[PDB]
């Protein structure tokens, strides 16, 4: 029911062939959009029925550069505007029109939208759009909306059918009788912020937003602040109460975490639980992340040890790419708080800022890297390097920050022939996008479903090297890779070994009983012997690597 929005603004989707698939995966079944609902560059034939359940948007709504004529958001009741398009608009409808029937948005059909808490409305250059000038927009803006500057272009290249004759006051989102605008603010008695009618009895509880079906904080169409199990309330119950004599902290059995506009018993997967009682993706200031025995992580206020920040964090907040100017900042980092993006400028250099091209050998700085809390984005890569094995120790990309707000892993326009991300076992959130890598095989040998953690995730892929061109050249998983899962060719690229590991190579059998030198197995790895251990012709030989655990000769 709760999903994450995007953060792409007007930027062009790199893969139009899969852009719509991404939106479907994000929003199918979703009712509450945490973040921004951005619907852009959609073609005339785009089926958008997967948006039909969206009821709340926490950030802004952007509908831009589409040729599709209808965007079905008829259940959207409230846009909270906690983020704003251009920092000013909760609703932006731009350039939806074409460069028999012409494309271009024809109606908004926001027939349930009765609440814009913060932000104005921007509607520009939509040549087929009607009814933006038959809506009393001031009714939708919340009583206390402090930023509602609004600019609505009403040039159109077609006649508009009048509102249905059943619409009171000639206000409607479209031509049908179901598109009449219901007023919930300007018709209220006693200046109450929202009502369901003209009398004082119709005033909503002040913790409601958007409207009501009755007088109580359980009759709201939306909560102004927090939904506490069907009750709209100003704040969630604290996780701690204080003993009334000592004021020592006591666990509160009714305590809840804040998550968007709701009170939850536990933070959802990939979110951090704070001591403040909030679910967050980025820890607040002066804090440190701690992993519990579950794998669940808590944020904790803090002599706080030094940390490796990636792009989008601290001094790298504005930095576009990993370059030769900042590459050394990641030396020895097991965990990068933030993201990594490799762009053409990373490896071309930039003479304007006198930034030298990033050399391939410098990418070895990531060999220690196990975890990226943000995303990994690679749109250029050294042609000499056949894979991404500089990240071969990377175990998880959390995706707490997502490229364009959607993608935790992006690989595009590269010359690599395989992935080589042989430790990658989790994409905590976001989609993977792998396209237009002309030489890249070993994409469908990866069990992507094992890496994902929620059903809104998927691999989107196109214009890589065709599966049959890879098969006809003999580029398949090694025989020792369990279930034909691998990240590249040979026995060092298996997801899971069929037998044993001697270091990085999957082998059929350790030299426990035969072969020289002898080895002992430990967690299905072939670790050797102390050389002064005489090889037993019959049985085992070593139980450890030192001369202590040694049979035939400190066995010196």
């Amino acid at each position, epitope marked *: 029911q709760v999903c994450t929005g995007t953060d792409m603004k007007l930027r062009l989707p790199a893969s139009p062939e899969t852009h719509l698939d991404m939106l479907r995966h994000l929003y199918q079944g979703c009712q509450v959009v945490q973040g921004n609902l951005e619907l852009t560059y959609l073609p005339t034939n785009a089926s958008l029925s997967f948006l039909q359940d969206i009821q709340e948007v926490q950030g802004y709504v952007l509908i831009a550069h589409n040729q599709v004529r209808q965007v079905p958001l008829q259940r959207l009741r409230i846009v909270r505007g906690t983020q704003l398009f*251009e920092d*000013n608009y909760a609703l932006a409808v731009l350039d939806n029109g074409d460069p028999a029937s012409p494309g271009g948005l024809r109606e908004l059909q926001l027939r349930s939208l009765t609440e814009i808490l913060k932000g*104005g409305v921007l509607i*520009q250059r939509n040549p087929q759009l009607c009814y933006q000038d038959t809506i009393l927009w*001031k009714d939708i*803006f919340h009583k206390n*909306n*402090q930023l*509602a*500057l609004t600019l609505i272009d009403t040039n159109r290249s077609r006649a508009c059918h009048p509102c249905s004759p059943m619409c009171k006051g000639s206000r409607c989102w479209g031509e049908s009788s179901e598109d009449c605008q219901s007023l919930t603010r300007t018709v209220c008695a006693g200046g109450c912020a929202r009502c369901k009618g003209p009398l004082p009895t119709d005033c909503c509880h002040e913790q409601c937003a958007a409207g009501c079906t009755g007088p109580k904080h359980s009759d709201c169409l939306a909560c102004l602040h927090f939904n506490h199990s069907g009750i709209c309330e100003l704040h969630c119950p604290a996780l701690v109460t204080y003993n009334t004599d000592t004021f020592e902290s006591m666990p509160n059995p009714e305590g809840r975490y804040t998550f968007g506009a709701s009170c939850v018993t536990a933070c959802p997967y990939n979110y951090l639980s704070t001591d403040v009682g909030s679910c967050t993706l980025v820890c607040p200031l002066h804090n440190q992340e701690v992993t519990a025995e579950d794998g669940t992580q808590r944020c904790e206020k803090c002599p706080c040890a030094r940390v490796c920040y990636g792009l989008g964090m601290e001094h790298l907040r504005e930095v576009r790419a990993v370059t030769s100017a900042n590459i050394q900042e990641f030396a020895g980092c097991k965990k990068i708080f933030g993201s990594l993006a490799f762009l053409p400028e990373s490896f071309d250099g930039d003479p304007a800022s006198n930034t030298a091209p990033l050399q391939p050998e410098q990418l070895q700085v990531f060999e220690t890297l196990e975890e990226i809390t943000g995303y990994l984005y690679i749109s250029a890569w050294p042609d000499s390097l056949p894979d991404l094995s500089v990240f071969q120790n990377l175990q998880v990309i959390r995706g707490r920050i997502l490229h364009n707000g959607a993608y935790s892993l992006t690989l595009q326009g590269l010359g690599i022939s395989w992935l080589g991300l042989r430790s990658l076992r989790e994409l905590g959130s976001g989609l993977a996008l792998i396209h237009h890598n002309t030489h890249l095989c070993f994409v469908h040998t990866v069990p992507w479903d094992q890496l994902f953690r929620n059903p809104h995730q998927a691999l989107l892929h196109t214009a890589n090297r065709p599966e049959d061109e890879c098969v006809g050249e003999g580029l398949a998983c090694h025989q020792l890779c369990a279930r034909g899962h691998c990240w590249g060719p040979g026995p060092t690229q298996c997801v899971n070994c069929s037998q044993f590991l001697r270091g990085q190579e999957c082998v059929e059998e350790c030299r426990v009983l035969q072969g020289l030198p002898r080895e002992y197995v430990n967690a299905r790895h072939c670790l050797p012997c102390h050389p002064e251990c005489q090889p037993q012709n019959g049985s085992v030989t070593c139980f450890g690597p030192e001369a202590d655990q040694c049979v035939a000769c400190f066995c010196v």
Partner: nanobody, 115 residues
């Protein structure tokens, strides 16, 4: 009624400065944001600088550091101080005030930067 009117437009060289004045008359106040829009020929009217109803200031990135928005509650005026002007700032500038959730507009004043 209520009216907004801009003055102070003019023509300067690149690097010049101008101060636009938006004079409000009638019963109107900045309750839900006020600011300056600009519109070039063959281009959209777009927000440049803004003060919200609770006093938060915002500037379009291309004018950040060069434009200064201010107000005089006694005179009921909104100002846009423009320094280090660039040819790309050439446009008609409009003030807009949001009051009781309705947006009111001036007539616009021409600013021309030559280079």
């Amino acid at each position: 009624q209520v009216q907004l009117q801009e003055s102070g437009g003019g023509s300067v060289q690149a690097g010049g400065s101008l101060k636009l004045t938006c004079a409000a008359s009638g019963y109107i106040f900045n309750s839900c944001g006020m600011g300056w829009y600009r519109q070039s020929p063959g281009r959209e009217r777009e927000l440049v600088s803004r003060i919200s109803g609770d006093g938060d200031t915002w500037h379009k990135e291309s004018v950040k550091g060069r434009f200064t928005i201010s107000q005089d509650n006694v005179k009921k005026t909104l100002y846009l101080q423009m320094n280090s002007l660039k040819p790309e700032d050439t446009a008609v500038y409009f003030c807009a005030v949001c009051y009781n959730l309705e947006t009111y507009w001036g007539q616009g004043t021409q600013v021309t930067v030559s280079s």
